């Protein structure tokens, strides 16, 4: 919490973020919009 | 008579030109000239590359220090002390000079 | 690691790929793939009808869409808005994304003289595309609603066209009422590439065409290792006739013993050895046509002082029987 | 040319010519060779062939500096003028950027002065098309190879040219040049001649100082006892103990064989005697002389010996107190490149392992109002002397505390000269 | 004596003999073979093709084909502004000769129709020039394109010389593509078609002009690494001058410069014992392969000089001047290296060409370095 | 055939009609309203960068917009004797 950040890489996030999301979500055309935002 | 102050920095890596050619002016010209590199960067000739101190005549010179601790001591006294007359004060203000100067104490 | 490697394969040269590759791509699948471009026909009047509301339409889908896009941008659209506003037809410029050698300068001095020089725009040239375009921009706003221009962009993730400085270019373009916008990308990761500012000055909609052809074009520029053991096969073809001797006396004891370190020659006994076929006269005779092999990196040397080949345990031999002998 | 008309000037007030002035007249480096004597046909007739026949060769001639390489090739020229020819010095240290070469050559055939890109047009427009003598000298070829060797490659096409009025001759640093730097499509076009030039022999090194010592050996001088003029109440000689002149050779011939190093050995050890002679009668400026062998073993150690062991004791108590802080943490550690934090960590720490009248002056001048120093005084000064001095050396980082340091000088002398 | 070997120094070949059928088309004026002319280097393969156009032009209708040198460009432009002086009239250059379009305006003849073949001279400063799949290639790949309907095609020939090119070629040019196709090669004639061009380079005959079968032994003994017999040739003209100087002997002459000084001439640069101390000290030092500082040598020069007592140690001035006797007669090369810690700084990295075999031989003979080892 | 090149150009209703008739009338409503806020916006900068008299003097006066998109354009007054000039400075151009 106090150490500086690690680095990503590419769809590790969606990785996790299929799974925290509330199947009821596939279609990623606003996922991919919002990462550029 | 030319003057040259940090010789060094034109003794780079990559050229050297302009010291090849002084160099050579004083093996070829008629015309009479001295050169007078100044720096101090100590070890100046391993600087230079083969073809550059070949034609350097090479006489270095090094420059004194204040090898006692009496030397900078007389050096001091030569400084301060003013030896021609312009002030009534001039022979009270040269003994008050050496007066401090002789005493180890002062 | 006992791993398979692609170096263990039964390799390929060059003609013989590129020969029996052209035989799959023109007969493989042809009969069901014009039977899709014939399914794919009756969407045409529909791509022309929302293309007068200025939507920057773009393709996805898997497969090439190169030779898909330029039938649909020049043969059928190009001259039927030409003849529905109403002369030379409209004028196509296609932009090669997969071509790498795309600026931003080259391509937008094309567009000032493909658009209308009005006005002397060469007075607001002195960065000033920005600046330029937005002269053109509002300009624009207030002239009468017609297309005039239709361009094309193959392959919009391509190696320079997805350079950050160039994307923002095309979205000022593509809020023009003027133009009309009719891209194509493959890549998976290409809804990456737009924000929710782009995109409002895109409007994009889009459109899946899958014909699943093979790219012959884009294929070129790419490469792998089919396109060094390969490399130093051609150099031995034109050399002298001694050093495929001395190449050979090398090549034997190399492989006496993967070709690696291990199973390669001191300098000195290989001096010998070489003096022993009358074939090397000293160490710089030797190593002078040495140097040539090391020159185009045919050999290696590490430490016994080892020359070793850096080429398989399968082709060294494969170097012996066809080119040394 | 213009100006050594206004080099001149008038009142020159009788300058005195000593015994030692008329040697380094001659003893000046300008003014037949013994040394390379075969060797200049060698060159000259691979000359007068392409000369007396309208041909275009090539002519690669190496060897160290100070040995006629530069000289020589004058000489070649210099007869052939009795009997067609353009000469041009292109020296390749005196070209400032490497492409001006161009535009001497397009000056040196009409006089026109055009850009290294025109020049070469016209050149190679001259090279293959004029029906029909063009001797160019390229000097210290080491300057003009070493961007992308594009300039190189045009110096040697010219040469294939069956219609080309040109001969080149190259003089190169090493026989190696074409071998390690170029490539061997310029290898091809450099030929095989390759005419080597080794260094000079101590017995030649005696027959090359002789012709400058030809007319002045064991001669006499007419000279006035006032003021120390010689001329070519006393009739004085002065004579030069050849022994003295075979040792200058034996270590010249063994070092370098160099024939500049030769000539001014002799030349700095002619001035040894000179003050010396002046310091004895003292003719300032306005029975039988001679050179002792003790000059010549002086000013060829004089090309030796150094000073920076008699700096270092010379120095500062502070600049001494520093280096020996310095090896006391290269045998600490073993890893002679040791951060400047712990330096300053152990200069501390070398106080408490007359040390207290020094501790109080190491970190103030007296002073109870401004004392408590963390780094001691000129900490900042004397790294700064020993840096431009060359002894050290320190990377550069904005923290002062983490940046290394490391020696310059052998550290065994270092530890040596600490022990006075 | 002089006028027989002063003539000395300077359809023929039996390469021409192929290119007419390469050219076959060249005087029945139609569209030619498809020529990219490479070679090894040294092979005569610049001069053999400008034989042929200059027997060509001779020889040969409208005659206009120019032949132009790339070698001062690195950019495709003014390759088709040389073309046009051969025409000597004036336009506007700049625009046709930069584009690939532009290139095809300009192939529109005015007097006669005669077809024009361009001869690219050196297209290997244009290949190993700038990066390749960028401009080079690119460069490369425009020129190659003959896809113009007319047969006035600007027929390219270009030379080369390291044989990587062709793999360098895109996937679609391979497919039969241009001028590519032909990769007539030069292999380096050993004596067998070289060595006769010397013979009837023997026109004019002088009387002793040497066993000609020591001739034959000069080309059966060079042609191990060599090119250019004329030049090795040049190299029989300047022992031909040694027998005019006296009033293969020189390749006898220039190997020993060569090889010696490892075998026998090492105790000849090491007349000082101590010269073979030193020599030894360089190379315990090398145990640390690091950057060998004339320091570090001297760090172990001491070090070692106070266990055995053989000689004083000596200064660090005169560790200057002694290893500059072992770097004039080529055995350690001194080099200024690289140390990135202020500037790029210049410590000096030395480099021995001795081996510990070539070592070994000439330290047993002397005990006073068997301390040492 | 040139398709390695990059960027070569060439030169080679019943219901509909109902539809015209609504959907330009609808985009009459649409950028009206775009001026509106247009005009909204290019306003109270308007105001609010003129008649801020602070008693100090040597202060620049400073204006967040927040949440703006980045592309608000402004105009300014004449307000002659003195020149009003606009500088702009994109990210790109600050090296
Ligand atoms: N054999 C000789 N006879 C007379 N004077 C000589 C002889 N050799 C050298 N010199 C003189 O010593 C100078 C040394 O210059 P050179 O040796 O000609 O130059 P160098 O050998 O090319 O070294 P460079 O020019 O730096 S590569 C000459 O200019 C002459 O003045
Ligand atoms: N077979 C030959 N017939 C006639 N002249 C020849 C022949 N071989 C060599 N020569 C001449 O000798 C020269 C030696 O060739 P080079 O020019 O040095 O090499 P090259 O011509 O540049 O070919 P490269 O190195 O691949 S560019 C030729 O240029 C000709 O002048
Ligand atoms: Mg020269």
């Known amino acids: 919490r106090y150490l500086q950040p690690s680095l990503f890489a590419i769809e590790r996030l969606l990785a996790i973020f299929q799974a925290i999301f509330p199947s009821l979500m596939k279609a990623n055309i606003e996922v991919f919009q919002n990462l550029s935002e | ?106 | ?325 | ?420 | ?373 | ?95």
């Open chain 2, 1 to 106: 008579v030319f003057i040259f102050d940090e010789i060094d920095t034109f003794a780079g890596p990559v050229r050297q030109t302009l010291l090849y050619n002084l160099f050579d002016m004083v093996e070829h010209s008629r015309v009479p000239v001295c050169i007078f590199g100044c720096t101090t960067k100590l070890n100046i000739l391993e600087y230079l590359e083969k073809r550059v101190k070949s034609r350097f005549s090479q006489r270095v010179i090094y420059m004194p220090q204040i090898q006692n601790l009496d030397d900078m001591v007389d050096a001091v006294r030569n400084l301060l002390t003013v030896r021609s007359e312009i002030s009534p004060w001039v022979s009270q203000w040269n003994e008050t000079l050496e007066k401090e100067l002789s005493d180890p104490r002062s």
């Open chain 4, 1 to 420: 040319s213009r100006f050594e008309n206004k080099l001149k000037t008038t009142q020159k007030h009788q300058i005195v010519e000593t015994i030692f002035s008329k040697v380094k007249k001659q003893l000046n480096s300008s003014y037949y060779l013994p040394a390379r004597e075969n060797e200049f046909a060698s060159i000259y007739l691979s000359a007068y062939s392409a000369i007396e026949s309208d041909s275009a060769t090539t002519i690669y001639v190496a060897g160290t500096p100070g040995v006629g390489k530069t000289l020589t090739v004058r000489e070649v020229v210099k007869e052939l003028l009795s009997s067609d020819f353009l000469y041009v010095e292109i020296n390749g240290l005196k070209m400032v950027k490497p492409t001006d070469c161009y535009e001497t050559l397009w000056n040196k055939v009409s006089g026109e002065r055009l850009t290294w890109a025109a020049s070469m047009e016209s050149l190679e427009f001259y090279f293959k098309r004029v029906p029909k003598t063009i001797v160019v000298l390229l000097d210290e070829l080491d300057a003009m190879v070493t961007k992308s060797q594009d300039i190189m490659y045009n110096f040697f096409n010219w040469t294939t040219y069956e219609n080309a009025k040109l001969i080149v001759i190259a003089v190169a640093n090493t026989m190696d040049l074409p071998e390690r730097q170029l490539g061997n499509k310029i290898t091809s076009r450099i030929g095989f001649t390759r005419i080597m030039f080794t260094g000079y022999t101590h017995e030649e090194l005696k027959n090359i100082i002789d012709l400058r010592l030809k007319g002045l050996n064991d001669s006499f001088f007419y000279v006035d006892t006032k003021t120390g003029n010689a001329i070519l109440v006393r009739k004085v000689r002065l004579r030069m103990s050849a022994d003295a002149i075979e040792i200058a050779s034996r270590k010249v011939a063994s070092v370098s064989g160099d024939a500049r190093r030769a000539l001014k050995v002799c030349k700095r050890a002619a001035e040894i005697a000179e003050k010396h002679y002046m310091a004895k009668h003292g003719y300032g400026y306005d029975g039988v002389q001679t050179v002792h062998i003790t000059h010549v073993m002086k000013a060829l150690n004089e090309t030796l010996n150094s000073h920076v062991i008699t700096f270092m004791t010379r120095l500062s108590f502070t600049a001494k107190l520093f280096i020996y802080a310095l090896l006391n943490l290269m045998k600490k550690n073993g890893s002679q490149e040791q951060e400047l934090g712990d330096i300053v960590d152990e200069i501390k720490l070398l106080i408490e392992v007359f040390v207290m009248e020094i501790a109080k002056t190491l970190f103030q001048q007296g002073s109870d109002n401004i004392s408590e120093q963390l780094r001691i005084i000129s900490w900042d000064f004397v790294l700064n002397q020993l840096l431009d001095a060359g002894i050290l050396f320190k990377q550069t980082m904005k923290n002062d505390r983490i940046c290394c340091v490391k020696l310059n000088i052998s550290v065994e002398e270092a530890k040596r000269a600490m022990n006075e």
């Open chain 3, 1 to 325: 690691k006992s791993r398979h490697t692609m170096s263990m394969a039964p390799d390929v040269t060059r003609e013989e790929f590129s020969l029996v590759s052209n035989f799959f791509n023109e007969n493989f699948q042809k009969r069901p793939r014009q039977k899709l471009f014939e399914i794919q026909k009756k969407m045409f009047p529909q791509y022309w009808f929302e293309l007068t509301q200025g939507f920057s339409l773009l393709f996805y889908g898997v497969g090439s869409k190169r030779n898909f896009l330029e039938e649909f941008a020049i043969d059928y659209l190009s001259p039927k808005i030409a003849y529905s506003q109403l002369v030379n037809s409209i004028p196509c410029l296609i932009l090669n994304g997969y071509n790498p050698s795309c600026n931003y300068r080259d391509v937008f001095k094309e567009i000032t003289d493909l658009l209308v020089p009005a006005e002397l725009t060469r007075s607001e040239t002195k960065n000033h595309v920005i600046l330029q375009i937005q002269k053109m921009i509002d300009f624009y706003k207030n002239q009468p609603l017609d297309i005039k221009l239709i361009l094309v962009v193959h392959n919009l993730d391509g190696p320079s066209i997805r350079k950050n400085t160039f994307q923002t270019m095309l979205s000022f373009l593509s809020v023009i009422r003027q133009i009309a916008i009719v891209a194509s990308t493959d890549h998976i990761y290409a809804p990456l590439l737009w924000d929710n500012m782009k995109a409002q000055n895109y409007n994009f909609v889009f459109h899946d065409i899958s014909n699943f052809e093979p790219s012959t074009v884009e294929s070129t520029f790419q490469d792998v290792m089919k396109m060094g053991a390969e490399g130093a096969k051609y150099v031995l073809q034109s050399l002298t006739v001694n050093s495929k001797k001395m190449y050979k006396l090398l090549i034997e004891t190399q492989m006496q013993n993967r070709g690696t370190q291990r199973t390669g020659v001191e300098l000195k006994l290989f001096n010998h050895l070489c003096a022993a076929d009358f074939i090397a006269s000293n160490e710089i005779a030797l190593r002078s046509m040495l140097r040539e092999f090391i020159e185009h990196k045919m050999a290696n040397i590490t430490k016994m002082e080892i020359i070793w080949v850096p080429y398989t345990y399968a082709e060294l031999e494969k170097l012996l029987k066809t080119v040394l002998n």
């Open chain 6, 1 to 95: 055939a040139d398709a390695q090149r990059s960027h070569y150009t060439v030169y080679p209703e019943k219901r509909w009609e109902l539809y015209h008739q609504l959907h330009s009338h609808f985009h009459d409503q649409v950028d009206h309203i775009i001026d509106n806020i247009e005009a909204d916006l290019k306003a109270e900068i308007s105001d609010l960068l003129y008649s801020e008299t602070t008693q100090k003097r040597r202060c620049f006066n400073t204006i967040f917009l927040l949440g703006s998109d980045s592309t608000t354009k402004i105009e300014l007054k004449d307000e002659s004797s003195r020149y009003n000039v606009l500088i702009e400075l994109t990210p790109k151009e600050s090296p």
């Open chain 5, 1 to 373: 004596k002089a006028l027989l070997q002063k003539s000395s120094e300077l359809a023929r070949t039996a390469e021409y003999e192929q290119v007419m059928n390469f050219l076959a088309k060249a005087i029945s004026e139609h569209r030619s073979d498809s020529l990219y002319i490479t070679g090894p280097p040294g092979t005569g393969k610049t001069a053999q093709l400008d034989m042929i156009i200059r027997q060509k032009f001779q020889s040969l209708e409208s005659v206009a084909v120019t032949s132009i040198n790339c070698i001062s460009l690195g950019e495709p432009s003014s390759i088709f502004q040389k073309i046009f002086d051969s025409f000597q009239d004036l336009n506007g250059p700049t625009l046709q000769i930069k584009n690939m379009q532009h290139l095809q305006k300009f192939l529109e003849p005015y007097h006669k129709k005669t077809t024009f073949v361009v001869v690219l001279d050196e297209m290997d400063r244009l290949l190993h020039a700038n990066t390749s799949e960028t401009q080079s290639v690119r460069t490369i790949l425009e020129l190659f394109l003959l896809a113009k309907l007319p047969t006035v095609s600007f027929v390219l020939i270009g030379m080369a010389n390291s044989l990587d090119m062709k793999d360098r070629f895109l996937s679609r040019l391979n497919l039969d593509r241009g001028l590519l196709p032909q990769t007539i090669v030069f292999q380096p004639y050993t004596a067998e078609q070289m060595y006769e061009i010397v013979i009837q380079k023997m026109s004019s005959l002088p009387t002793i002009i040497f066993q000609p079968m020591a001739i034959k032994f000069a080309a059966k003994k060079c042609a191990g690494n060599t090119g250019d017999l004329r030049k090795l040739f040049d190299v029989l003209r300047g022992s031909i001058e040694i027998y005019e100087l006296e009033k293969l002997n020189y390749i006898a002459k220039v190997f020993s410069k060569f090889v010696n000084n490892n075998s026998t001439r090492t105790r000849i640069a090491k007349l000082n014992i101590q010269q073979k101390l030193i020599l030894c000290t360089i190379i315990q030092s090398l145990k640390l392969n690091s950057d060998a500082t004339i320091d570090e040598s001297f760090d172990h020069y001491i070090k070692a000089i106070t266990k055995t007592d053989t000689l004083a140690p000596l200064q660090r001035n005169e560790f200057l001047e002694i290893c500059t006797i072992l770097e004039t007669c080529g055995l350690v090369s001194i080099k200024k290296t690289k140390c990135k810690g202020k500037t790029k700084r210049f410590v000096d990295k030395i480099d021995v060409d001795l081996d510990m075999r070539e070592f070994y031989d000439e330290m047993t003979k002397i005990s006073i370095l068997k301390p040492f080892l």
